[PDB]
Amino acid sequence: QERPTFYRQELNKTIWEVPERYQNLSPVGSGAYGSVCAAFDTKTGLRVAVKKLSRPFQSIIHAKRTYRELRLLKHMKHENVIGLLDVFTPARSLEEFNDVYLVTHLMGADLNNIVKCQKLTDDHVQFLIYQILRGLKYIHSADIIHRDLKPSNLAVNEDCELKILDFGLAHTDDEMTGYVATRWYRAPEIMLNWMHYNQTVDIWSVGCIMAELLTGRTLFPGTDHIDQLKLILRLVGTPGAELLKKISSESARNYIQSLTQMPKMNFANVFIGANPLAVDLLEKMLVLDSDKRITAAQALAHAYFAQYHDPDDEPVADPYDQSFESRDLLIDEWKSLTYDEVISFVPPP
Numbered sequence: 001q002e003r004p005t006f007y008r009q010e011l012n013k014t015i016w017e018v019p020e021r022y023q024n025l026s027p028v029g030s031g032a033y034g035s036v037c038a039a040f041d042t043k044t045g046l047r048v049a050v051k052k053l054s055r056p057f058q059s060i061i062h063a064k065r066t067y068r069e070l071r072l073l074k075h076m077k078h079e080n081v082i083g084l085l086d087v088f089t090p091a092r093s094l095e096e097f098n099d100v101y102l103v104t105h106l107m108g109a110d111l112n113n114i115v116k117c118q119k120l121t122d123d124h125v126q127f128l129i130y131q132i133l134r135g136l137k138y139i140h141s142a143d144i145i146h147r148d149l150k151p152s153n154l155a156v157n158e159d160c161e162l163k164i165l166d167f168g169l170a171h172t173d174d175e176m177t178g179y180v181a182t183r184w185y186r187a188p189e190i191m192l193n194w195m196h197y198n199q200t201v202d203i204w205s206v207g208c209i210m211a212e213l214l215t216g217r218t219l220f221p222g223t224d225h226i227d228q229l230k231l232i233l234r235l236v237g238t239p240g241a242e243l244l245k246k247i248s249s250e251s252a253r254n255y256i257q258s259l260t261q262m263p264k265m266n267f268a269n270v271f272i273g274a275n276p277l278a279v280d281l282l283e284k285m286l287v288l289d290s291d292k293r294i295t296a297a298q299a300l301a302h303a304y305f306a307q308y309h310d311p312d313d314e315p316v317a318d319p320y321d322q323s324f325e326s327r328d329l330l331i332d333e334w335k336s337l338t339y340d341e342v343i344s345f346v347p348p349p
Ligand SMILES: Cc1nnc(-c2ccc(-c3cc(C(=O)NC4CC4)ccc3C)c(C)c2)o1
Pocket: 033, 036, 049, 050, 051, 069, 072, 073, 082, 102, 103, 104, 105, 106, 107, 108, 109, 110, 155, 156, 164, 165, 166, 167, 168, 169
């Protein structure tokens, strides 16, 4: 409708200009999330997170990624998936449009914080993984791949309710180097660029996360890519003939064949004392050949989630047109598209 009144403040060397409805902005994440503040939305009574994009139209790559994040956020309407509460710019025209602010729920913590600082019963694990899978079914149904699912991008409130963050944005080589959580959840096919990957990479990550919730320990805490691969192959076995043929990277194929063949281990011996149904599901997620991993929709129907599974309450997404991903456009063209998306935004019911 009408343009709200905006007010300005400096928050860590940066000037935030936001509608009056948003009060008590304070930075959050310790830099980790980007440039993000928590706030109180006096209009809804919700605690919100506000991300200010940093000079978003500085290159074609920045402009396109700004548009991509906004498109993604606008599309996602699911309880277990972060969605857009509001998007604004103080700009009164396309000519002056140069900052984008995205508003979402503030859950209050991430899973990293939880699995570090609390004791998780088998029931907690069931509920947390059920929700990630319910969110992923939705995401994958729109032909979106997370690609970087890990504890730190699972946002969780005090009732253990969960929303997935950061899907579809796909890190520098440096960030993925060494003993780092940034690589510990990645499917091997993506870690070592074995082949054209798909949504199945996300299921590997869920297996890694679920294992960690059950044991309180990182499943594959490799010191580097090669050490991580060795940790992985020790648990799930070395690839067989069928999978080797699917590694299109002649280079990666050649290297993996240099390794001594190892059989898949007994998961009941690896996950001592765990619910046999949890062990069964982990076996179905942690399959080296991505073609053979359980899908999110298949997983929701697995006996481990009998207590939460409701097939009438696991919605899919409306079609997501991502044809823009193949498009080469100028900065001003990506910017104008982003502007149209800001201007046309209608807040949720
Ligand atoms: C703590 C705590 N509790 N909740 C949060 C939190 C919630 C939402 C966000 C958030 C996520 C995306 C995102 O996932 N974009 C990609 C397109 C998907 C975009 C904007 C925001 C504010 C952030 C950074 C933190 O932090």
